[PDB]
Amino acid sequence: RQTMNPSIRYLIGVDGGGTGTRIRLHASDGTPLAMAEGGASALSQGIAKSWQAVLSTLEAAFQQAGLPAAPASACAIGLGLSGVHNRQWAGEFESQAPGFARLSLATDGYTTLLGAHGGQPGIIVALGTGSIGEALYPDGSHREAGGWGYPSGDEASGAWLGQRAAQLTQMALDGRHSHSPLTRAVLDFVGGDWQAMMAWNGRATPAQFARLAPLVLSAARVDPEADALLRQAGEDAWAIARALDPQDELPVALCGGLGQALRDWLPPGFRQRLVAPQGDSAQGALLLLQRPS
Template structure:
């Protein structure tokens, strides 16, 4: 059993990866960011992004990455697919310790400081989670793109692109919103859009979400954002029907979507204490402590 010299927290989604590096005592040394590491984009790609971001964090701290002395805590999108999770663990390098959980769980740990509460994470994808006062936890949503992930960036983009399609073939008048969507896709005509649609993945659709937000006054965009707010409320109600727990809206779309959450739920929103990467750092700390106990080197 290798000794743990460093703790690493990983927050991996469909758009990017965030890394927090700390020493064995938990003192933060550096942060870094990299490409997507959500498992839906492939296990090999996930590890490539994680390794590149970790190497960047170590370099920023003036250190060399040596996996054998690292305890890695990962909060990743896509671990609810057991085959993807098994593949990810199978391809892991030699580590001092490893714990892989849903990014919903690490977001939950970070947002409420390990205390009871609800989170709704809205970024490239979306998921909601609750930590009960007895320590149990559960999730709602998060079934993945394209059928699930309500209120996410990919969900918004997938629906917004319909407006561009209809503007291109005359079913609705072209306008500034449709033009901005087409410009974001670098598309000029119907054939180009068909090619884009055939190649687009979750990340590509999420790239259209800023266009929706920039045109929030447009009827189509306004309707999508209102539906996103209503869907966030439904996720909260599914996990906390008695409305007894605080709620943190997390992720890259948290701030712009907060105003669309119904007033009955908006009053319960609290700023997250820390983010998913720091929640994953706590996973790494626990994993490191567990590996020490297993090796018989802890009291």
């Protein structure tokens, strides 16, 4: 019945990254009070904006739960944000932080891992604009694979698929290759001509390349070139997982919208072992408070 640390009255779980922020507000006893969404809070977009994003979304959580906003000193907050890998961004973030009773900062992927397997050992492979694999071992340890970053890494992510798709189209445009369905679809998407791809590729970002991913999906059923990209993404996803668990000893969940759309191209032996995640990242952020720093 009693709760530890009577000064802490609220438990907050925050999931933030690239496109938005999701917050789960709970009572110190575990009672789910509210759940809210807000703007993006990836650290790469700014520390001050990140907090403004998290706080504004937290402000909505209380309101939504018919409760007056509580002082920071009465709250324990765990956050899984994109950009925590960067030591410098995490520091300014922790430094610019309100006076929460307790703050636990982890990455986007770690809290997704914790939520997917309810805090129990396991692995997750997250495929979105980018990609990463995270694992929690029975001995308490944690490891990562993949997730090194956009240009060179991020295999099986949609930015990876977009880059390849764009490259194939560029090759079709200058004669190194002939056109194919994917290639024609990408050319129209881009603007319809040489100049258009040149301009488009000139200002490309991970999010822009990722917008080509759905074009690879549609084209793959009629174009062997797109089919190979999807298949390679499938193998790379498996490779991420095998590096974290060589003997397939732990449970595995495939997170991300791209992951659901890629299912048919996942190696059968890897797909067969997938399990639905028990909770989302915001849930995992809550679990962060229930463990050591």
